[PDB]
Amino acid sequence: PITGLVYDQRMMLHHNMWDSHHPELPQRISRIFSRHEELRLLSRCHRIPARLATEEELALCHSSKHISIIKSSEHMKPRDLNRLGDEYNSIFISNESYTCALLAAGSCFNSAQAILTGQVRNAVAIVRPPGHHAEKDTACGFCFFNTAALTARYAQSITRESLRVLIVDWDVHHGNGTQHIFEEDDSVLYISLHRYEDGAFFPNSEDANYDKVGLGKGRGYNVNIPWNGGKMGDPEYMAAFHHLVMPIAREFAPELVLVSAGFDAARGDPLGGFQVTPEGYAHLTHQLMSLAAGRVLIILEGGYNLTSISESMSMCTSMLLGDSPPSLDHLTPLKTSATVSINNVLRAHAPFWSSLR
Numbered sequence: 001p002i003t004g005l006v007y008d009q010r011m012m013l014h015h016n017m018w019d020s021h022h023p024e025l026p027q028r029i030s031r032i033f034s035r036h037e038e039l040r041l042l043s044r045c046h047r048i049p050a051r052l053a054t055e056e057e058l059a060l061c062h063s064s065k066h067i068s069i070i071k072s073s074e075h076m077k078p079r080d081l082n083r084l085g086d087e088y089n090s091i092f093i094s095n096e097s098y099t100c101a102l103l104a105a106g107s108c109f110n111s112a113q114a115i116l117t118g119q120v121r122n123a124v125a126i127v128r129p130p131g132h133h134a135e136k137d138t139a140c141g142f143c144f145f146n147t148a149a150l151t152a153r154y155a156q157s158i159t160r161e162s163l164r165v166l167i168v169d170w171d172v173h174h175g176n177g178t179q180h181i182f183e184e185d186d187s188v189l190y191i192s193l194h195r196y197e198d199g200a201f202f203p204n205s206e207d208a209n210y211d212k213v214g215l216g217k218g219r220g221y222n223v224n225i226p227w228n229g230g231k232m233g234d235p236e237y238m239a240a241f242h243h244l245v246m247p248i249a250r251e252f253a254p255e256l257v258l259v260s261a262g263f264d265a266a267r268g269d270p271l272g273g274f275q276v277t278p279e280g281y282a283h284l285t286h287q288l289m290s291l292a293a294g295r296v297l298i299i300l301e302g303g304y305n306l307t308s309i310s311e312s313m314s315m316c317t318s319m320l321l322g323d324s325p326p327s328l329d330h331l332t333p334l335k336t337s338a339t340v341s342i343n344n345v346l347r348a349h350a351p352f353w354s355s356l357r
């Protein structure tokens with residue numbers, strides 16, 4: 001029962017060459033990694049080597065046009081990199097972005113393979129750039145390829161096509177890319193908790209609302225938990241896990257759990273506006289570990305307070321290693337709008353899940 005860890009400093013090379021103060025800094029992952037060494041979590045883990053995703057593996061979720069357009073950025077001069085990135089919503093590109101995107105996806109492939117072959121029980125992936133905003137045919141919100149979506153498809157390719165994968169997305173933003181990719185799919189259950197503000201928060205789309213339950217055979221397999229008008233924290237996310245995430249997950253019975261683990265909902269994040277504590281993330285991780293015989297892969301998405309994301313993700317790795325979960329409140333009453341949100345999701349998904357009756 002070992003925990004895997006994958007990290008490669010080459011993923012720092014991707015950067016915003018016109019703004020050295022951009023929040024998607026290279027030091028996001030180096031600070032997370034350095035904290036794992038200071039807390040002596042690194043030497044307790046088994047080091048998974050990073051690798052490059054192949055274009056065939058990328059084609060599991062993305063179109064040939066999108067892959068070839070991102071690949072062509074390798075050769076561009078800065079003036080043309082700037083024009084190309086301006087065609088997207090919140091995207092900056094450099095000459096090494098494609099390679100870094102390949103390394104983030106290939107690293108999680110090796111981690112899922114290590115989990116599904118039994119080499120490790122679970123794993124953590126300290127990777128960048130993130131992926132959950134990336135669509136089949138376009139890049140968006142600092143994401144080029146959908147690392148979590150690709151990993152679920154890669155997981156099915158090395159086991160069986162119908163492998164039931166649960167994607168839990170606790171990044172403060174809606175994973176619009178992951179939802180659309182698996183929207184008609186009933187083998188991948190997508191559960192996202194995200195700040196919504198009636199569609200005013202990025203990515204500013206009503207697709208993130210609670211009534212989007214999936215399409216076709218995927219009806220019931222898309223669970224949006226949208227927060228509105230409130231500084232959500234540990235009590236709200238714990239109650240969402242107790243009423244929605246866990247009863248639906250246990251009925252779905254996943255064989256593999258992927259966590260789009262953004263930490264921009266953590267306390268102190270400069271743009272998330274929430275106050276989830278590192279002990280809160282630790283509790284959420286310990287919960288998910290009770291699923292799928294403990295086969296949990298935690299993939300870094302967003303998070304932009306260097307101290308916050310380093311302490312938060314370190315708490316998650318400590319849970320995967322088997323350390324005792326923190327004791328939290330449980331009796332703290334929720335903000336009223338959070339009870340409204342949880343009740344709205346229960347109402348929209350009760351027809352599809354007998355555990356929600």
Ligand SMILES: CN(C)c1ccc(C(=O)N(CC(=O)NCc2ccccc2)Cc2ccc(C(=O)NO)cc2)cc1
Pocket residue numbers: 021022023090130133141142171173201202262264271301302303
């Ligand atoms: C350079 N600096 C300091 C910022 C730049 C953009 C924002 C921002 O606001 N966005 C969201 C957004 O709404 N942009 C439109 C807009 C228009 C006018 C005013 C304000 C915003 C970008 C963003 C995208 C994805 C993720 C993510 O993947 N997180 O995990 C994070 C952030 C903040 C600071």
Ligand SMILES: [K+]
Pocket residue numbers: 169170171172173174175192193194
């Ligand atoms: K989310």
Ligand SMILES: [K+]
Pocket residue numbers: 182183184185186188189190214218221222
């Ligand atoms: K789905």
Ligand SMILES: [Zn+2]
Pocket residue numbers: 171172173262264301302303
């Ligand atoms: Zn985010």
